[model samples]
Target: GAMVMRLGDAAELCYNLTSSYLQIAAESDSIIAQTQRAINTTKSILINETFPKWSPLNGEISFSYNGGKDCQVLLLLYLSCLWEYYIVKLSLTKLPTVFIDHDDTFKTLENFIEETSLRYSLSLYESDRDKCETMAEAFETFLQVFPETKAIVIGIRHTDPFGEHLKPIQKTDANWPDFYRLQPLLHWNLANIWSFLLYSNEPICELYRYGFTSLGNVEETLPNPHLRKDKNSTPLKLNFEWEIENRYKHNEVTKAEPIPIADEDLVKIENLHEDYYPGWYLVDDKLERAGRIKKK
Candidate 1:
C-alpha cells in the first residue's frame, strides 16, 4: 500500500516530536508535574496491570502501521499488542480513543472495530465521510450520546498528505488545537515500524499472510491479486485499471501537498544520503511491483 512507507516515516517523526514535548514539559515545574502524573499512570499500568480508571488518564493519540512490507506496521503492532494487553489486564479506563484508518479494512480500522465489537458490547463510532461517511455520522452520534466523554483515541496510518485520507473526520477540523492531539508513532516509517514489530515478535494479520499488498474491507476494498505468488489462484489487479479508467475514482484520492522541507532539513537529508521518495511511491511502486518492492 502507498501508506506503507508513509506510516513508517510518520511513526519515527512523531517519536521525535514526543521527545521534544517531553523536554519542554520538563523545563516547567507545573508541566513536569502534569507529565509525571501521566507517565506515572502509564508506568503503573505497565508494572502492576491493575489500577484505578483514572490512574492512567484517557487521552487521544494516533497510530500507524504500514500495510505493506513497511516495518512500522509490525513495530506498532508489537507495541500496541503490549499496550492493549496492559489495558485489558488492568481495565485501565472506559474512555474510547481514536485510531486513524486509511480506507483499507484489512490493516487498521475495520479489523480494530471487528475485534473490539466481538470482545466488548461497546458500540464503536466511525467518522462519516464520502468513503466511510458512515463512520463520520456514527462518530457524531457517539459524541452526542456521550457528550461527557473524556478522551478520543485515533489511529492514523501515515502522516504525509497522501496518508491524510486514512484519517478520521477530526483531522479536517481546522479548529483542532495542538495540545489535545496525540501521535504515538508520529515520525516513524515503514522501516522502523516493521523492525520493531518483527524484533518484538508480534502477530501478523491474515491479510498480509495471503500476500495482499494493501489492506481494507472487501466491500469497498480491493485486493492486489497480482501480488500473489500464484497468479492463477487470484484475480488480476483490477483495482488499479478500474480507478484509472474512471475519473470518479479519483474522488477517493485526497489531494494534499507535501509539507515543505526546510533548508536545514534538506541539508540533513542530503548529508545522510538518504534517497527520498514521494508519498505517491506507495501506490506507484506497489502497483509496479505487484505489491512487492524490488530488491536494490
Candidate 2:
C-alpha cells in the first residue's frame, strides 16, 4: 500500500531516511568505499556548492524520477547529501518528487517505481500522458502542479546526446523551463553507474537480465542483440552481417548477398526486436543505447 503523508509528515520521514542511509554508508566501508571516488566527488560538490546556493530558498528544490537505474543512483546520492544539510539543522522543505508516466513504460519498471515510492516514503506526484503528447507538455504540467518549484534534480548523464550540453549545475535556457537543472551524474560513465548499483545492492529492473542494457517505451525498445547468444555456441556478436546470414539460412528472405544496412540505420534495427529474444551475459558499455529503437 502507498504511504500517504502530509507536508510536515513527509518532511520528517525524508529526514529520517536520509540520516539512516548516510549512517549505513558511513558504517559499511563496502557500501560507500567501492564508489568512494565518484561518491566523494559528487557529495562534496552538492554539499559545498549546490545545496548552499539552493537550500536557502524554501520549496525551491525537487527531483525528477523515472524508475530507471541512473535515477535510482541520483536519488541515493541526493539523499546522502541531504543528510549533510540535515545534520546542520538547516531549514529544508520536503517537496513531492515528480514522475511523468507515458503509459508505454514497462510493467515491471512501473511496479518498481511504486515500490520505490513506498520504500522511500516519497511524496510522489505522478503525471500520466498519452503517446501522442510531447514530453515538453508533461514537464509543463508538472510545473503547474508545483508552481513554487525553482530547481529540478535530473539524472541525465553526459553520454546521452540530449544531455551533452548540460553542466553539473545550470539554468534551463529561455526556450525551456526557467528552473535550474542539477546533474550530479554528469561525469559518471556507464561502468561507474553499474559499479555503484552492484555495491549499493539497489534493485535493478529484471529486464536487465534479459539483455536490456537500456530501456525506453515498449514499442521502440528491445533487448540488445549484441548481448544475445546461441546456447551451444560461443558468444555471438550480432551485427547486420550476422542478421543477414541467419535470414538466408532460414529462407526467411530471398537475398543471396548480405543486404548491408547503413551505420545509422543499423542502430535503428538493433533497437527493434521480439520481446523474448534470448539475451546475452555481457554488455559493451560503448553500445549502451544500441538497443534503443525509436518508434517511427
Candidate 3:
C-alpha cells in the first residue's frame, strides 16, 4: 500500500528497461516496441488512474482472472505494475482474485489456474461447480460474498463478444450491483496478447500448444483445428479417394488398410486430431474464437 507515484521516482525505471528489453526474438523489433508500449500504457492506467480510484490497499478492488490466454497476458501486465508500485515496496501478501467457475470448466484450464495461483500467490476465490447456471449469477453472488470490492480488473479484450461495447472504465449492468469494471486490455487484439506472451516467453497453458486459441468450458470449447499443422489429410485422403474410386474393381473391396479416419465418426478424428498443431499465437488473429464450438 505504498504511495504509487507517477512516471517519476523509478516507476519507469522498474519496467522501462524491459519495455525495450523484450526485443528478444520478437517477430520484429517494432513489435517488441508495440508490446512494451502496451505494457507501459496498461501500467499507467492501472497505477496512475485505476489504483488511485479504487484502493486495493483497502480491499476495494479485486481482479477477475482465469486460464485463458487473454487473462494470462493480463496477469503478466498487472503484476509488473504491482511489482513496481506495491510488490517491491510493500510486499503485499496476496492479490485478491475472483474466478467465475463455469460449471464444467475444463480440467486443464482449472489446473492451469491452480498453477498460476501458486506462481503468483493469488488468493483465489472459487464458486462451487455447477452451482451457478450462468456466469453473471456467480459474479453477482461473489459480490454478495465480498461486497467490499468497488471495482474489478477484467482481462476482456475489445474483440471479446459481449464486451465490444465496454471501455477502459465502465460500470456493471444497471441490474447488477454497482461496481466499476476496469479493462486495461480493452483495446488489445489477439496479436497483441500473443506478442506480449511470446516476447516474454511467459508460461502458457498446454491447450494453446495445440489449437485451443480460446478457453471456455469442457463441452463448449474445442481445439481450433483451423490452426492444425498435421492437417494434411493428403496421405489418408489419397488412399481414401483411390479406395472409394476402385471399390467396384474388387468384389471383396480392396482393403489396403482403409484410411484410419474413415470410420463412422470421421468427425471425431478431426476433433481429436488437433494434435501436432500450431500454437495459439500462430493462429490468424481474426479466428481467435474459432475454438469455441457451437453447442446444441
Candidate 4:
C-alpha cells in the first residue's frame, strides 16, 4: 500500500541557530551510531526541505504526536530542530499537533497526551472520532478540518505495521487524501528507538511504565512478559523516605494520584508493569510489538 525508499536517498542542509545535539558520553551505555545519523538527517530534512516548503510557522505543517516510542522519538527530533530554526524568528510558539483519539483507549494514555501537549505548548487537535471507525477514516476527518496542511511530520519505522518499505517522504495510499508523508524515523530499528528514548531521558506515557509497550484498545495490549523484572533486581516503589534524598527527581509527596504510575524508571519499571516488564525500551527487537495481545 506504500512505496519505500532507502534511507540513503533522503537529504539535508546547514542552518545557523542555537543548535542542540543529543550527546553520547564516554561512559554511556551502548547505542547504534545510525540512530544519531537518522535523527540528524531528520533534523536536516525538517529544517531545510520540509520547512521551506511547508513551514510550521505558517500553519502549513502538522505533527502527529502519538505517544509511543516511534512517534515520541520523531516528536523529540522535530521539536529540537523546530527550536533551532524558529527560535530566532519569533519564539517557540504552539506547534499545530494532530492527536487521533481512537475512542477505545486507556485513561492513563489520554491523560499523558493531554499533559504532553500542554507541556510542549502544542496546538492540539484532540479528536474523539465518535463515528470514525478506521485509521484512514480518522485522518480523513482530520484533513477536512485543517485543509491547508501540506505535510504531516509523523513517525514510523520500516518495522511498524502498515510500514515496511516506508521512505523518508512519501504520499498516502488511495484510501487517504493526498499529502506529503514526512517520516523522519525511517530505517531506524527498534533498538534505535529505545536507545534514543533512554539517551534523551524524556518522559513517556505512564502506561508504558506499567508494561504496555504499544497502546491500542484499553481491553487489548498487554505487557511484554519477556521484560518482567524480579523484585530483587528492580527498585519497586520509590519510598517517601527516598524522595527526601532525591527531591529534584520524582514525586514530592503522596497524593491521591491518578491512573497508571509515572515512574521515569519505566525504562526499567513496568513496560519493564510499574516495576512488570523491564521497560518499553528493553523489549526484544524481534518482538518489538510483543505486548500486542491478540483480539478476542
Please list the C-alpha lDDT of all candidates, in the order they appear.
0.33, 0.61, 0.63, 0.61
Q: What lDDT tens digits, residue by residue, belong to model 1 across residues 1-296?
A: 23222322322332332233234323344423344343333333333432232122332322222223332332333233334444434442222333334443343334434443322222334443234545444445555655554334333335434554442223334433222222223234433332222322223333443334444343433334343334245433322222123211111122112223334334433453333222222333325224332345
- TM-score for candidate 3, residues paired by index: 0.74
Tell me the TM-score of model 2: 0.69
Clashes of each: 48, 1, 0, 14
| Model 1 bad stretches (over 4 Å) | 1-133, 157-181, 219-296
How do the candidates rank by lDDT, highest first?
Answer: 3, 2, 4, 1
TM-score of 4: 0.73
lDDT of 4 by residue, 148-237 (tens): 888888887777787777787788889887888998777677656665565443466767656666666655566665555575665433
Query: What tens-digit string does per-residue lDDT give for candidate 2 at 139-219?
Result: 777788878888888888888778778888898877676788888887776655665554443445656656677777766
Best by TM-score: 3
Best of the candidates, lDDT: 3
